[PDB]
Design a protein around this ligand. Sequence first.
Ligand SMILES: Nc1ncnc2c1ncn2[C@@H]1O[C@H](COP(=O)(O)O)[C@@H](O)[C@H]1OP(=O)(O)O
Ligand SMILES: Nc1ncnc2c1ncn2[C@@H]1O[C@H](COP(=O)(O)O)[C@@H](O)[C@H]1OP(=O)(O)O
Ligand SMILES: O=C(O)CCC(=O)C(=O)O
Ligand SMILES: O=C(O)CCC(=O)C(=O)O
Ligand SMILES: [Ca+2]
Ligand SMILES: [Ca+2]
Lengths: 415, 415
Amino acid sequence: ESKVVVPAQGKKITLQNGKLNVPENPIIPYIEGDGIGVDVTPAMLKVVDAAVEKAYKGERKISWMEIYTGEKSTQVYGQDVWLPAETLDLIREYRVAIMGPLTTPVGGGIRSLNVALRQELDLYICLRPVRYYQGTPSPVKHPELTDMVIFRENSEDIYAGIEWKADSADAEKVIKFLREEMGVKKIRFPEHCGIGIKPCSEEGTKRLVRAAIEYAIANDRDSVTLVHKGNIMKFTEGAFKDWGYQLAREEFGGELIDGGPWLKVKNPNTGKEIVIKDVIADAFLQQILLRPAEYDVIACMNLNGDYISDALAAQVGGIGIAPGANIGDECALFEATHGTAPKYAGQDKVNPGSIILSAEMMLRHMGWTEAADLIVKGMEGAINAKTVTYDFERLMDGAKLLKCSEFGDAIIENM
Amino acid sequence: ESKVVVPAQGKKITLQNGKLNVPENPIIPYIEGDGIGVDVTPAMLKVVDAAVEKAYKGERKISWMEIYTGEKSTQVYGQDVWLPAETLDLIREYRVAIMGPLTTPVGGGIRSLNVALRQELDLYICLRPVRYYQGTPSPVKHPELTDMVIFRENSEDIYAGIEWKADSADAEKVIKFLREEMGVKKIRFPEHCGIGIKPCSEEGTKRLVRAAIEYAIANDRDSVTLVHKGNIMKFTEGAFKDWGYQLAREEFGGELIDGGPWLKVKNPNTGKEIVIKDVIADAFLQQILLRPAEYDVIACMNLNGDYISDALAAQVGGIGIAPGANIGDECALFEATHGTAPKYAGQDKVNPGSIILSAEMMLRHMGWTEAADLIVKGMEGAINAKTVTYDFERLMDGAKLLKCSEFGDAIIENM
Ligand SMILES: Nc1ncnc2c1ncn2[C@@H]1O[C@H](COP(=O)(O)O)[C@@H](O)[C@H]1OP(=O)(O)O
Ligand SMILES: Nc1ncnc2c1ncn2[C@@H]1O[C@H](COP(=O)(O)O)[C@@H](O)[C@H]1OP(=O)(O)O
Ligand SMILES: O=C(O)CCC(=O)C(=O)O
Ligand SMILES: O=C(O)CCC(=O)C(=O)O
Ligand SMILES: [Ca+2]
Ligand SMILES: [Ca+2]
């Protein structure tokens, strides 16, 4: 028995040959989110409606439709309903959706609801753009040199949750198989030993890298860097790097730069040379601090992407305003990237920036670039104005302290 | 037929009940290192001899004994000799050794010689202290707030090199076993798929965490933070966190702080309260930038430790001067932590700081704290004096440019 209400006014977005067809009255499912979701989601709804209204002078309007996942889903659908089947069906059916932060419970053997959503809908691209907003307090000297776009592989890697607990019958069984059937000698302590599996496939790697390159082409970016720990994990991380370079050669006319290993790919629209290169992951966490300007589009595996995105967000003072998308071939789910921060929930206190900027990515994904531009513009103005939420204000002098909802208004005020 | 020459003057260090017995004329094996090893090692030898000579007025002297691993080993012992058996025997026999950077060849199925050395000698602690040297050009505003000591688990994790290449008969076999015998459903693309294994054991985790806590006690440090990605990898990363906390409760009288989950451990020598806490790895890469002062001793798994150490080193401007040790129960191997940088090899140009500070850790490990203190003092003086190698100088105004060997002298000059 669904508790979802389809808006009476409103039409579903359609997908016609890899191309979204967005009506002027699209229905957008949204998940409020747990904890501070109660604060940031309404700020996002208001800010989005304003930008859309201003951009198209009332010709277009989103019909928001609440759907459920997480703690609130249990309150709505009952006890063990953390992720209702219909939520998966609805996101797929309506093609574009957005969500606040989710609470995954502990003690019940439930795995990350965020990851569940990504894997279940096969949203194989985790897209995390990272730029600096002038006026943001940052811990680094030159945050303005950071302008990157992370394509993080979302469907494979150790992140896929294949593992067995130490001393479990399964763990014992897997370890037996490995030592006796596979002749594995390098397990240091085979007893009381947990075991995880890290898969990385040619198809998985290539759909991710294909998207990263298409994005560099579509947006006239300077380069795509394959980031990997291939010198230690040759057949997963190293294979990802090799497949990445290969895809570039096979589908995009990638050709050797000097002695290699870097390649150049010609932008078929602008004729610009896009550099395809690679950096070992540990060095890369150094290079983003020391030479951020040399990096643009990044393509990498699941776990590394997680680390890199977070490291970048912190460096530009954007820990609380980092936008993110999960994109597959059939639908897309945009998200607040921070946690539920239950301590502040309901206080109208936290920064709605992250979910607002994810909504910006959503609008842009929908082809409503004018409205998306107004959000970027509003965000830039409000931050420049030093009219900000506590998390920014406490790090600045002469800022005006705004509530969550008030920061929403300040964004609108600057549109 | 050994090509190693045991020094005529000199005595071997001994181990008596977990306690090193160091004679006044200890023999120390050293591996020159490939590439810039030719530049930094002699700078290290000279700087160490000076500190030892000054500290003990000639009463003590190290008898350096060259041993081999890497490219130079092939030149010495022949074609496929990258890591001679005797090198393992010698390091174990002489208890304390140091090395420059190593070249692991590509194309021959040889795995990291660094990792080989660590695993083969069971040097299960990778010890990476990270502090700021006043005067070092850093990309962050307040590098002086960083004063941490990383205990990185060295013997397990995905870093152990257990994996099979996509399309290999073994890969196919492992994937078959997993899908059909283990009922694994979450491998997205089972074809053309590489597979790695990530082990984490109770014993492996606890010997690492035990060392981290003993170190916090011995050095009156404020806290030990377990860093892990346990919310996604429950049975490896999560188990490491749980075992860590458990070890603290079982062996060190760890007790709940407030509602937990943090614990307090009483320093049995100073009565100081040592906090045992934990942070998810992705957040931790943010927290080291945003709140570096809240962190002290870190305990974490192999791969995470790799990332964290490198990220920290970059933030304090120490990418080229980061010291490191590999420590086991029977011996210890100190190392330059940077690469071989072949482009500058032999130019007497690069920064010998990393290997010099690893030598500082070696001297301290040997109980020769007075000599170790003189190196710290020299390094602080030379850097403060702005008398530095190109890698520092190019980032500063009004520095004096020194060659590698000259920077060695500047350190001595400041002792
Ligand atoms: N949008 C936001 N605006 C301001 N602070 C945030 C935001 N999101 C997260 N935080 C901070 O990060 C944490 C994220 O919550 P959690 O990781 O427990 O789910 C919160 O405790 C809060 O930390 P703080 O106590 O420093 O203000
Ligand atoms: N001790 C050092 N002093 C100065 N620069 C170093 C040092 N170690 C490494 N580097 C730099 O880091 C790289 C490490 O070498 P590799 O990772 O290829 O093995 C070198 O190319 C050099 O980069 P750079 O060209 O910026 O001067
Ligand atoms: O999603 C989770 O629940 C943990 C991993 C994470 O933060 C992410 O994947 O972005
Ligand atoms: O050791 C290697 O060869 C690569 C990994 C690394 O740099 C390290 O483990 O410190
Ligand atoms: Ca994250
Ligand atoms: Ca490293």
